[PDB]
């Protein structure tokens, strides 16, 4: 699969991946900066801790940086 990957936020080949994801969570700067954002690819939709948001998708470049 092809996915956007942080920190570069470029489209990269993940030949062994099947999903792209967008992961968001509050670090201790959340009040000043909003949520942290991680973009990656995985073999399967990653499992995450309760206060972490993850959205998985299965099309090339389906996880662009969430600007809107």
């Amino acid at each position: 699969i092809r996915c956007f990957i942080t920190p570069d936020v470029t489209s990269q080949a993940c030949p062994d991946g099947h999903v792209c994801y967008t992961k968001m969570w509050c670090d201790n700067f959340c009040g000043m900066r909003g949520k942290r954002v991680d973009l990656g690819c995985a073999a399967t939709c990653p499992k995450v801790k309760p206060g972490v948001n993850i959205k998985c998708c299965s099309r090339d470049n389906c996880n662009p940086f969430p600007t809107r």
Partner: antibody, heavy 126, light 108 residues
Framework: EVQLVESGGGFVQPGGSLRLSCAAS????????MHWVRQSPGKGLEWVSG???????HYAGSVKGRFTISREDAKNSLDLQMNNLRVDDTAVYFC????????????????????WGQGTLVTVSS | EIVLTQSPSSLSASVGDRVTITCQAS??????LNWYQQKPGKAPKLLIY???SLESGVPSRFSGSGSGTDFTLTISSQQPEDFATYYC?????????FGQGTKVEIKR
């Protein structure tokens, strides 16, 4: 596998020069702020110099006029030209990556030093 | 420059002890405060950024707290792996400055 590998360490008389180099692998080097941090038993950890992803250089007052930081993005290398060396420059020098954290509000650099090289010894003595 | 002073400079702990290390800044640095761990002959390792945010893989016994001029690193259950020197570091303003280090030694 993210790596910083230092070279160019050595020893000189006071007033001598050395050039440290750091080879970066496993990340897009040009995207990151890069720094040099030194350590001696008597100075603890001391930030020396930083060269931001925008080409902006910063220096500790202790090295101003004597040290020059540079990078060659095409060669994934960061250098520290050390001139007019003083005995109190004797230290282990670490090549260090500044953090690059993404938030909904944008891109933040050098909050912390997340990747450190093994360090290379510089000795200045008569 | 901003001066960070850690207390104590060294302490002795048993395995499973609660260890607390403080870092005091010469001026307000909001939460621009990191903690590093360093063992002899090794580079420092980043454990905590933004005063309280753990890096990936850092075990839950590590926590950070504070803001402004006063910060605390707590190791709630000291492990053999945790005997090391700890440094705070401010990223509020140039130059970046570190505390003097706190060495955690094994009590026997």
């Amino acid at each position: 596998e993210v790596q910083l590998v230092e070279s160019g360490g050595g020893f000189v008389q006071p007033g001598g020069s050395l050039r440290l180099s750091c080879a970066a692998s496993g990340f897009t080097f040009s995207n990151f702020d890069m720094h040099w941090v030194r350590q001696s038993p008597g100075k603890g950890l001391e930030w020396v110099s930083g060269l931001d992803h925008s080409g902006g250089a910063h220096y500790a007052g202790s090295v101003k006029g004597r040290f020059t930081i540079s990078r060659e993005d095409a060669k994934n290398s960061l250098d520290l030209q050390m001139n007019n060396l003083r005995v109190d420059d004797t230290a282990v020098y670490f090549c260090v990556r500044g953090t690059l954290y993404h938030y909904t509000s944008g891109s933040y650099y050098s909050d912390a030093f997340d990747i450190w090289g093994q360090g290379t010894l510089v000795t200045v003595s008569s | 420059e901003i001066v960070l002073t850690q207390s104590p400079s060294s302490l002795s702990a048993s395995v499973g002890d609660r260890v607390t290390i403080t870092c005091q800044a010469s001026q307000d640095i909001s939460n621009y405060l990191n903690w590093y761990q360093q063992k002899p002959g090794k580079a420092p390792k980043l454990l905590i950024y933004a005063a309280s945010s753990l890096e990936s893989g850092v075990p839950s016994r590590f926590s950070g707290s504070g803001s402004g001029t006063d910060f605390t690193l707590t190791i709630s259950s000291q492990q053999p792996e945790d005997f090391a020197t700890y440094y705070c570091q401010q990223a509020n303003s140039f130059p970046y400055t570190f505390g003097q280090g706190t060495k955690v030694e094994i009590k026997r």
